[PDB]
Amino acid sequence: STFRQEDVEDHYEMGEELGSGQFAIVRKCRQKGTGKEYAAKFIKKRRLSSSRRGVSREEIEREVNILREIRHPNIITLHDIFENKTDVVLILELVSGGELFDFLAEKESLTEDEATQFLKQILDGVHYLHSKRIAHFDLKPENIMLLDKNVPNPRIKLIDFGIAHKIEAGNEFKNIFGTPEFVAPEIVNYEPLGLEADMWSIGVITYILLSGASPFLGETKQETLTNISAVNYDFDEEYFSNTSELAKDFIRRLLVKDPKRRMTIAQSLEHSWIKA
Amino acid sequence: STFRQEDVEDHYEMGEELGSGQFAIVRKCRQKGTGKEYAAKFIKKRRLSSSRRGVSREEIEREVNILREIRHPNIITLHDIFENKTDVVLILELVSGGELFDFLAEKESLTEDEATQFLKQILDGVHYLHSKRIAHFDLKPENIMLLDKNVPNPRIKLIDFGIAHKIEAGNEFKNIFGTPEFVAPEIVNYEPLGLEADMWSIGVITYILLSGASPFLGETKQETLTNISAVNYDFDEEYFSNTSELAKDFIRRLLVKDPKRRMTIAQSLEHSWIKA
């Protein structure tokens, strides 16, 4: 594929920095032709043959390709793609209403009806992707952005696909990526991956939505990963004293070591806790 | 343990930024009491209970503890430790002569006698650590700094211990850390770890010193890790056409999937290729 070999500065005005990914730098920008505001994602390119400062070209295309197919209200849109020697610049949809992580702390804990209002939107977005055999692999509060934060039940779009793959496979797909807190045991153990890893993440997100705490985080990175592979977590009455058995079951049907016994996305939408 | 709960700015002047680690920010600084120049490493602290922006407190102490014991000419020294709400600030020795990665590209390839001049110093530093049962876990050209770059056979000190552990164990130690290119298969497969992982890294460094290329890097992260677990590499005549069998053997006795059959640090110093 080929992106626009042009100066992004010619068509978009840069300013206010937003996210700060590993090799990704996000900046709030302004389209000159219309005045519309967009979000520009700078992806540094893997330099001279053998290096690690930057993302590989082949890995950048993968992300673009996925954003191209993608088309769903609860999911980000890619408008333009630029490129130069050093960086590829994805012009993306701007979601100004802040991350879900930010939103949580200020409420600190949601009611089950509120929690399911957020969850339904995720499950819709994740359902759409899984239909097209796309695994996000990085579902977490930081990649769940609200359109408007100051409305009663805020509406969300999913962001960041630098790690998403198409599981278009009678193949084998393994590797280690994502944030330790949210990764499924197969990623931790370096075992075959599928769409099932995202269902583990949602289980973790849901735990965080209800309790506020992360089910698997420990005092060290080592320990966080031990807990995940072991599946060492419990519904600590502290938070789950007044949580329904259905809500518990939903989470308990998603945090299952064996990816096959783990719930799928269509089963999650048919659950009594989520279903109307 | 307890660090200096004081403003680092009161005792050291900041300026020129050097490295840019994940949660670590390195800055070149100047001691006020003497005028001596030091390197200040800012470590962001893991914030409200459940988070990932920053290193855990327990993980920061571990690094400090290791730098405290540490005492060897080819190894960095920790002078002071400060702390505030957000960051812990390690005042470290300043190594101005740039990274080994930087040095390589401008040469771009070393002679075996030169290569062993660098290697001996590493093996000495790594030997000292392994004696005290300390595994660096992050041996790579970016963590190997030269004192003076413009001298014939430059002298090096090892840096960055945010990932180093003491393998003081009738215990189990597993987790995933380091740069994909240099990590040993047991880290990739999430299997028990020991001092042996560092011997894999040196094998990789040595390959890079002689050839310039990284033995296991592929076009994607997935592929890089496949090659490591598989141990898929060959002495490509392109680079190794004129490389000695001893140099080959040394590398070949270090890139062994099974950590036990892999060479130990004392065996590496007794090798004909390294030994006087």
Residue numbers in the entry:
A (entry chain B), B (entry chain A): 2 to 277
Extract from the study:
Members of the DAPK family are generally involved in both apoptotic and autophagy pathways and share significant overall sequence similarity with myosin light chain-related kinases and triple functional domain protein-related kinases (Temmerman et al., 2013). DAPK1 and DAPK2 bind Ca2+/CaM through a closely related ARD, which is inhibited by phosphorylation of an identical ARD residue Ser308 in both kinases (Shani et al., 2001, Shohat et al., 2001). They also contain a basic loop (BL) in the kinase N lobe next to the kinase active site, which has been identified as a DAPK-family-specific signature motif (Tereshko et al., 2001). We found an identical type of dimer arrangement in all three kinases that involves the BL of the CD. In terms of functional implications, CD dimerization in hDAPK1, hDAPK2, and hDAPK3 is likely to inhibit catalytic activity by directly occluding the kinase active site.
